[PDB]
Design a protein around this nucleic acid. Sequence first.
DNA 1: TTATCCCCTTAAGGGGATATATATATAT
DNA 2: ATATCCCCTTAAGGGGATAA
DNA 3: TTATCCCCTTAAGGGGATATATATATAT
DNA 4: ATATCCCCTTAAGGGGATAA
Lengths: 71, 69, 69, 71
Amino acid sequence: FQKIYSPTQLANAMKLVRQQNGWTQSELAKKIGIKQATISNFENNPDNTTLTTFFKILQSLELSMTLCDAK
Amino acid sequence: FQKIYSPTQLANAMKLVRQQNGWTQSELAKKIGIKQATISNFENNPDNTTLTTFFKILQSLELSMTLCD
Amino acid sequence: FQKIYSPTQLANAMKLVRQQNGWTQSELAKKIGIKQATISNFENNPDNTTLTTFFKILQSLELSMTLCD
Amino acid sequence: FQKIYSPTQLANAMKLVRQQNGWTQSELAKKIGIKQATISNFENNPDNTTLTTFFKILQSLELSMTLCDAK
DNA sequence: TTATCCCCTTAAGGGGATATATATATAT
DNA sequence: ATATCCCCTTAAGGGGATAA
DNA sequence: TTATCCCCTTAAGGGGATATATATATAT
DNA sequence: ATATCCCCTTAAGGGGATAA
């Protein structure tokens, strides 16, 4: 996949994956035990999103992250 | 690098690098435009840190972040 | 005190006191009229030390020396 | 016995003990493996006598020494 | 017996100094 | 605040052994 | 569904500083 | 060169829930 360098770049990448699998945000939120709300919050306005939050999103998406070189 | 699954994890990994390249929290603070306490704050208690700061660090630390399966 | 049977013995005992009363080789050197190297010389290699010095120390160290059976 | 505070005070104490037991200096010297000579040296002029020497004298005299308080 | 005296070599203790260790101040 | 080192002068103690 | 909006409490990140720790100079 | 603390201003995310 692609490397990411900004708050938004990221949330944008998640949404893609979300929709591409057809998972209702409300349903994603339920699994990790949060509000379909905060998932929106994250999806529209990521800059002020916390990390635990972010990471929870990640797990629900059956995804994971990794560091690497700033090309 | 390895597979990161949480804040304190991403924090341990990021800290590990900070020292390895010899860098400290101050020299990287001025560089990317933020407070020194912030970074330290991130390293020991990363949970509530915002995403904007997580990245100001990635660029000061000058490493990327891609995702995997 | 205990029963002393040799130079390195009398040296170990005498040194032990020097530190215990907090004293050092210099402060006791000036006091009894001799060189600092001398005392140190006595403490690690006491065998060839002269009797005059052994006593300048006893009086600076301010302890006596009697004999027993 | 008496406490001792000087090179001579000492050698003097030894001589007493030597004679009081009737031990020829030559014989004392032989036991500790030295010269009846150095025993004289020690006996007449102690200030410049070494310690090992002194201690050897002591053993031949079946004596021993101890530290104590400068009253 | 034991007080001295010869020859030889090993060093002590003083004068004059000094790198290291032992225990403590001070810089980011 | 110890342990060490240089240069020097002075004596120790072992070889081996004689006046007193 | 999903982008927003209310009420409440927990804190982050900045300004402005500072005792302690971590690694290093300096006094007898 | 870390971790911490004060005061403040600003937003997050959970309660619980409605326009679009």
